[PDB]
Design a binder for this molecule. Structure first.
Ligand SMILES: *[C@@H]1O[C@H](CO)[C@@H](O[C@@H]2O[C@H](CO)[C@@H](O[C@@H]3O[C@H](CO)[C@@H](O)[C@H](O)[C@@H]3O)[C@H](O)[C@H]2NC(C)=O)[C@H](O)[C@H]1NC(C)=O
Ligand SMILES: *[C@@H]1O[C@H](CO)[C@@H](O)[C@H](O)[C@H]1NC(C)=O
Ligand SMILES: *[C@@H]1O[C@H](CO)[C@@H](O)[C@H](O)[C@H]1NC(C)=O
Ligand SMILES: *[C@@H]1O[C@H](CO)[C@@H](O)[C@H](O)[C@H]1NC(C)=O
Lengths: 115, 473, 101
């Protein structure tokens, strides 16, 4: 389920089954490793333009500034928003995609850039 | 055949078939002019106005317009926004006003020329309280859609003051009719008890949602304060194990009731139905029934008042009418047996609050009466077949015992074989042999199974509940 | 003929005048908060009153700051609950085991 995107100045990351509904009950950790002195530019490609009025659980996409589940929390995103672009020089982005037991969505599409 | 006119107004589709309320309105007057049990020397004409939805100004214009013709008693539309002005006009010119929907009662309106056949939500709510108490629940959960729902169920809402209950509240999203977020919130919440409040269309459209979300499991016990519960096409459900309980004012025991039902169907299913909606198409609706029964009550009131004339009352002539003074009295004094049986008027505020509602439930065959109720004597539930049809306690002579176990590595194992085997013979281990010996020594009729918990069964301190073996036991 | 109106206080007298004004284009001002019907298309009214879809949110905030785990509401007449519904729905997320009298 995971994709090694290491040693790419840029490359493409998305929910598995990106065009279709993302799979259920999925817990896949996605890892961004940038070499020292590099600045991390995440580019997130949203699929749907509408504003959710509710930030609810069951389905979340985590962002960590350093090793996942372990490092300081940057944010927990949900809804149909594209999150704003994330610039950190912590050199390590450690991302998880979650899924609930039902009610999937359009999925998500992301891009990472390193300088 | 004394000519007389009935103020008729109907918020209306402004397209398509006839107004349900209005088709009922015509039906009743037709029946009037056939049967001579009523008004031998009287035959009743009427006037039809149709005004926009929720537009009080436009309403008042047409109200005055009919009062130019003169009628007997306006039958105001189904919505507060217009109801209020029509009521004010009716008393401002002294003519009775009849109503058919509960609306928000204004805090301290002193006017006294109207009634409202629909039974009050206070008393309804009280009966709801009694029923909930009867099942002795602890964590019910409420769901409305319009804020006006909170106003109606207040008497339930305050109940956390006296009995021991617990009660959240959630609101249906105004648009999209999409409870998938909402129902998911309920499923994670594990809210087994639900009350609803909605025009029964939403009730049907949401039950399908519940089934698709798989909520339909015998654990949940729905209750729907909406009254026309019997129109519900419960068929895809009566084998799912839940019970739906919602009161029916329309007493269907009477023969004349059903007879009028089928005739109404002949001229109502004449208007084509909606096959998707999940309804027993071509059926009475509480409003339609009520608009019917109102016609008879006005008929009764007029039946003893031959001195009625019809003054062409000019609104801008601000002097009142004449004959309504004792006319409204007579109406208030009426007592009648119509499609909903007993009908009365509380003198205190001129609102019907005395009545005889009939609890029903999802019978596995359908929807059947399993008791009655009234404001006065509280829950009169006929405890029949509770333990025996003969009413004497009896036990099935032959046993039909079931046994539930947990897969335990030496104790309970699924019978390891490449070919399948089912029944109460698919397991092997220690406990299986012990059970076999129980059977050999006493001759059991056991059934072996698992619990969805599949554990020892554990106390649930979130609610004092237990799990698995303990819950099922 | 006028260019504006200052209107009444009750719910009743209010909405009738509002329907009348929007029936002719004349602007209409309001003071008393009232019950907006949820299905009205009307456009020609305003109401300066600090609307309770905000007071309720703020009262919730204040509750959250004082960190009460139990609270009791006391209102006066019906329309109160309507006014306070944004509050009532609170226990959906937070823990406010409240009552009502
Ligand atoms: C005009 O009024 C509407 C309705 O008040 C405003 O929309 C927003 O509606 C929500 C309804 O729950 C209000 O609650 C807030 O929701 C957001 C998003 O979930 C949440 O982050 C807030 O903490 C709060 O729960 C919200 O206050 C309200 N927004 C406002 C008043 O700005 C609409 O935005 C208003 N438009 C204008 C031009 O003021
Ligand atoms: C629901 O109805 C079925 C069939 O009458 C009954 O066996 C069961 O006890 C009822 N109660 C629930 C909520 O399971
Ligand atoms: C009539 O209304 C009053 C209001 O206080 C209520 O107490 C009473 O139970 C109602 N019923 C009758 C028919 O008296
Ligand atoms: C209900 O009322 C009737 C009145 O005849 C009475 O016989 C019955 O015992 C009451 N309770 C039940 C069981 O519904």
């Amino acid at each position: 389920c995971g994709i090694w995107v290491r040693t790419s100045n840029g490359g493409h990351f998305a929910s598995p089954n990106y065009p279709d509904s993302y799979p259920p009950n999925k817990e896949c950790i996605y890892i961004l490793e940038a070499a020292p002195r590099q600045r991390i530019e995440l580019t997130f490609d949203e699929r749907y333009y509408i504003e959710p009025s509710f930030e609810c659980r069951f389905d979340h996409l985590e962002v960590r500034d350093g090793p996942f589940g372990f490092s300081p929390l940057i944010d927990r995103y949900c809804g149909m928003k594209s999150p704003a672009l994330i610039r950190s020089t912590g050199r390590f982005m450690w991302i998880k995609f979650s899924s609930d037991e039902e009610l999937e969505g359009l999925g998500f599409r992301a891009k990472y850039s390193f300088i | 055949t004394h000519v007389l006119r009935f103020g008729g107004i109907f918020e209306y589709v402004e397209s398509g078939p006839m107004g349900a309320e209005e088709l009922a309105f015509r039906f009743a007057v037709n029946t009037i002019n056939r049967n001579r049990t009523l008004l031998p020397n009287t035959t009743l004409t009427y006037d039809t106005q149709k005004i926009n939805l929720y537009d009080s100004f436009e309403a008042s214009k047409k109200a005055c317009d009919q009062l130019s013709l003169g009628v007997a008693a306006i039958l105001g539309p189904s919505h507060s926004s217009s109801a209020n002005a029509v009521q004010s006009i009716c008393n401002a010119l002294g003519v009775p006003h009849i109503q058919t929907r509960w609306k928000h009662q204004v805090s301290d309106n002193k006017d006294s020329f109207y009634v409202s056949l629909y039974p009050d939500f206070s008393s309804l709510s009280r009966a709801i309280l009694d029923l909930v108490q009867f099942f002795k629940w602890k964590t019910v959960t409420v769901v409305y859609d319009d804020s006006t729902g909170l106003i109606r169920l207040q008497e339930l809402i305050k109940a956390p003051s006296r009995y021991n209950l617990r009660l959240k509240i959630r609101q249906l999203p105004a648009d999209t009719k999409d409870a998938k977020p909402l129902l998911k919130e309920m499923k994670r919440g594990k809210e087994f008890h639900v009350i609803f409040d909605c025009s029964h269309e939403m009730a049907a459209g949401i039950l399908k949602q519940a089934l698709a979300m798989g909520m339909m499991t015998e654990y949940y016990h729905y209750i729907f304060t909406t009254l026309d519960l019997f129109a519900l096409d419960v068929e895809p459900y009566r084998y799912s194990g839940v019970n739906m309980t919602g009161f029916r004012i329309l007493n269907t025991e009477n023969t004349q009731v059903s007879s009028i039902i089928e005739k109404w169907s002949m001229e109502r299913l004449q208007a084509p139905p909606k096959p998707d909606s999940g309804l027993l198409d071509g059926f009475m609706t509480t409003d339609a029934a009520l608009m019917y029964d109102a016609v008879h009550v006005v008929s009764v009131a007029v039946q003893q008042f031959p001195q009625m004339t019809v003054s062409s009352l000019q609104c801008n002539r601000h002097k009142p009418w004449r004959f309504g003074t004792r006319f409204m009295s007579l109406i208030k004094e009426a007592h009648w047996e119509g499609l909903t049986g007993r009908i009365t008027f509380n003198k205190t505020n001129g609102l019907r609050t005395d009545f005889d509602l009939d609890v029903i439930s999802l019978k596995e065959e359908g929807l059947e009466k399993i008791g009655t109720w009234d404001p006065a004597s509280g829950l009169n539930m006929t405890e029949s077949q509770k333990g025996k049809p003969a009413n004497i306690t009896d036990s099935l002579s032959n046993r039909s015992l079931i046994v539930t176990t947990i897969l335990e590595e030496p104790y309970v194992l699924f019978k390891k074989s490449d070919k399948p085997l089912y029944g109460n013979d698919r397991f092997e281990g220690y406990c299986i042999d012990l059970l076999r010996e129980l059977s050999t020594i006493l001759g059991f009729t056991y059934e072996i199974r698992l619990v969805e918990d599949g554990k020892y069964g554990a106390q649930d301190d979130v609610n004092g509940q237990w799990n698995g073996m303990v819950r099922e036991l």
